[PDB]
Amino acid sequence: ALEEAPWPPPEGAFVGFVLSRKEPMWADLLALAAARGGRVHRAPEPYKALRDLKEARGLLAKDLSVLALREGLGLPPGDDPMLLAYLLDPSNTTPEGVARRYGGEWTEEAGERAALSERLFANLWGRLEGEERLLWLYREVERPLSAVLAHMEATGVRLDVAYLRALSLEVAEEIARLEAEVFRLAGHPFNLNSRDQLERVLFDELGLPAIGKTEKTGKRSTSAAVLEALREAHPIVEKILQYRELTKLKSTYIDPLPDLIHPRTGRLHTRFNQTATATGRLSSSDPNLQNIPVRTPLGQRIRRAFIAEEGWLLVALDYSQIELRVLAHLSGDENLIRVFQEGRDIHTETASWMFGVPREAVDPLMRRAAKTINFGVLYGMSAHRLSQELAIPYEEAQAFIERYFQSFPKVRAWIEKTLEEGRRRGYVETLFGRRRYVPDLEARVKSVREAAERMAFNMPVQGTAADLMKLAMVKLFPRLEEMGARMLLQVHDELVLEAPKERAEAVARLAKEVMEGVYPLAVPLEVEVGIGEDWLSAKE
DNA sequence: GACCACGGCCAC
DNA sequence: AACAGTGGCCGTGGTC
Numbered sequence: 001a002l003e004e005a006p007w008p009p010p011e012g013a014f015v016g017f018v019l020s021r022k023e024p025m026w027a028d029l030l031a032l033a034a035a036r037g038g039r040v041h042r043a044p045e046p047y048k049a050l051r052d053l054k055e056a057r058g059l060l061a062k063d064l065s066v067l068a069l070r071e072g073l074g075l076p077p078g079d080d081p082m083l084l085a086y087l088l089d090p091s092n093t094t095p096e097g098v099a100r101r102y103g104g105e106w107t108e109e110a111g112e113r114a115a116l117s118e119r120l121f122a123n124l125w126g127r128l129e130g131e132e133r134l135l136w137l138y139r140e141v142e143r144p145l146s147a148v149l150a151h152m153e154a155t156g157v158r159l160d161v162a163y164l165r166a167l168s169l170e171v172a173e174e175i176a177r178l179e180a181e182v183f184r185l186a187g188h189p190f191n192l193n194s195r196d197q198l199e200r201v202l203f204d205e206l207g208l209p210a211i212g213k214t215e216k217t218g219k220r221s222t223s224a225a226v227l228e229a230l231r232e233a234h235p236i237v238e239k240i241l242q243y244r245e246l247t248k249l250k251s252t253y254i255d256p257l258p259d260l261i262h263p264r265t266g267r268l269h270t271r272f273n274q275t276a277t278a279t280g281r282l283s284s285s286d287p288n289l290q291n292i293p294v295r296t297p298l299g300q301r302i303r304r305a306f307i308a309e310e311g312w313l314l315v316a317l318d319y320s321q322i323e324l325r326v327l328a329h330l331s332g333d334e335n336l337i338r339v340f341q342e343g344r345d346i347h348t349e350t351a352s353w354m355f356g357v358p359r360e361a362v363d364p365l366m367r368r369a370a371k372t373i374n375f376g377v378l379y380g381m382s383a384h385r386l387s388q389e390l391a392i393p394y395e396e397a398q399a400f401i402e403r404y405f406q407s408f409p410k411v412r413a414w415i416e417k418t419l420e421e422g423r424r425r426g427y428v429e430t431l432f433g434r435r436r437y438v439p440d441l442e443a444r445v446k447s448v449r450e451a452a453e454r455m456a457f458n459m460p461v462q463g464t465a466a467d468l469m470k471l472a473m474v475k476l477f478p479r480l481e482e483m484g485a486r487m488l489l490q491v492h493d494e495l496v497l498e499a500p501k502e503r504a505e506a507v508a509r510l511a512k513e514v515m516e517g518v519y520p521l522a523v524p525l526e527v528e529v530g531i532g533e534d535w536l537s538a539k540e
Numbered sequence: 541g542a543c544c545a546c547g548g549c550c551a552c
Numbered sequence: 553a554a555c556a557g558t559g560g561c562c563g564t565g566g567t568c
């Protein structure tokens with residue numbers, strides 16, 4: 001940890017390493033070091049020294065394991081003090097912040113990162129002695145999960161590049177037509193992408209009324225909620241919303257994604273961040289593949305670009321009404337449990353209410369609208385906003401929210417119990433004991449307290465569902481290798497797999513069973529599954 | 541070139 | 553916009 005011994009290190013040492021850049025699939029490995037006892041080992045040539053390691057044990061283990069897979073080396077991740085910190089407090093999200101909480105410094109030298117990994121592991125493992133529930137989540141979920149994510153990251157997903165490039169041009173021509181239509185209505189040209197320029201045109205030059213203001217700077221907002229509020233008080237607004245949709249999808253997905261294909265795989269490689277969220281969810285970045293478009297007809301065209309290798313099929317599995325089922329288990333609502341022990345669909349039921357139509361005539365776009373509504377209401381939405389999203393008088397929306405919860409009395413009782421317990425203990429917890437600390441529950445400004453309250457009772461629900469999915473991933477991944485299949489993506493309550501066409505149907509059937517039986521609840525988990533040549537087909 | 545705050549908006 | 557929650561990436565506008 002200050003003293004130096006010749007490479008290689010002894011078995012079980014802690015590793016540090018420096019990458020030329022944050023993405024492991026794209027990084028040059030600039031330095032590799034390892035630490036054990038009172039000694040640090042430094043490698044003369046980093047790529048060769050990788051061959052010597054049996055596992056990756058230390059800070060950001062998964063990242064080094066991914067780079068090793070890229071080179072054809074099986075170097076699974078083992079212990080990672082970031083995972084210990086994240087289980088102790090999920091505000092622990094980066095090495096910089098962990099080190100300056102638990103007794104070190106994160107620099108840019110591999111040998112220091114290795115010596116830091118050594119101490120940070122000893123400190124945090126000691127803080128976890130006696131937290132049997134957190135130790136369980138570390139050994140049975142997070143640590144084995146890191147290996148699953150490393151393989152997902154190194155495998156990647158195939159993308160139809162020539163398609164997206166052709167699509168970029170069709171979208172550009174439609175963007176330019178819309179720009180010209182707005183310029184004409186404004187009587188002049190300007191930067192439609194400049195929020196501040198648009199504000200002035202809409203609210204000063206034209207007379208349009210300003211419905212709301214931005215948070216930090218108090219400017220007149222031009223957000224969709226504001227604009228759609230007057231989608232007919234001027235047609236220009238209508239075109240602006242269509243321009244925004246198109247430019248958003250072009251600059252975020254259509255244009256950048258094609259330029260991210262890796263030269264040695266032919267595929268697109270995301271990163272699955274395991275200590276990035278306050279609830280236990282994963283996140284995805286560089287690029288985010290958890291927010292690929294899907295809701296609009298153009299977003300659908302984009303999602304179709306995600307395709308199976310030649311000779312394989314994509315398999316898509318998605319839990320049914322997942323947080324609603326979890327809520328049933330957590331709250332013990334007899335009436336809510338029943339709903340699911342009878343195969344009812346509350347998303348479909350709210351849509352039938354919303355659109356005045358029998359359950360037989362709800363289509364997939366209707367039910368999507370009802371999902372946002374049902375979860376909006378659930379987690380604390382206000383009567384006022386609902387009346388505005390649903391386009392109905394204030395008093396009509398007040399009432400749905402009343403009936404929504406009368407249905408299931410035990411829910412509000414579980415909310416209040418969770419908060420009281422969170423006020424007493426400092427934190428709220430998932431079914432498996434994952435914690436989120438929420439101090440503001442006893443803040444003296446109502447607005448701050450009530451926000452903390454909404455964050456606080458959402459966490460056990462969203463975080464239990466994430467625990468279940470993570471555990472499902474951990475159980476499923478060994479069965480996929482034995483069938484010659486691959487795990488490609490996770491989108492919170494959804495998995496995408498890639499399987500040989502000859503094994504696709506068996507793989508689907510199997511993955512569904514594992515997901516549904518991951519951890520029986522007081523309510524059955526149902527999983528929808530589809531198979532197709534592309535990401536969209538598989539979700540149908 | 542690198543970093544940042546902000547408004548805004550995609551997904552779950 | 554807002555008494556829904558959880559993320560990450562865009563362009564703009566700005567500094568060093």
Ligand SMILES: O=c1[nH]c(=O)n([C@H]2C[C@H](O)[C@@H](COP(=O)(O)OP(=O)(O)OP(=O)(O)O)O2)cc1-c1cc2ccccc2o1
Nearest residue numbers: 295318319320321322323324368369371372375493552557
């Ligand atoms: O606005 C939201 N707020 C929120 O907190 N979530 C959470 C809660 C859900 O259980 C979980 C998984 O989401 P999801 O798989 O899409 O939905 P569900 O599992 O409940 O239902 P199903 O699979 O169709 O049967 O994500 C989702 C949405 C939402 C709204 C929407 C509209 C379109 C497409 C997806 C959507 O997602």
Ligand SMILES: [Mg+2]
Nearest residue numbers: 318319321493
């Ligand atoms: Mg679902």
Ligand SMILES: [Mg+2]
Nearest residue numbers: 318319493494
């Ligand atoms: Mg889903």
Ligand SMILES: [Mg+2]
Nearest residue numbers: 021541542543
């Ligand atoms: Mg730069």
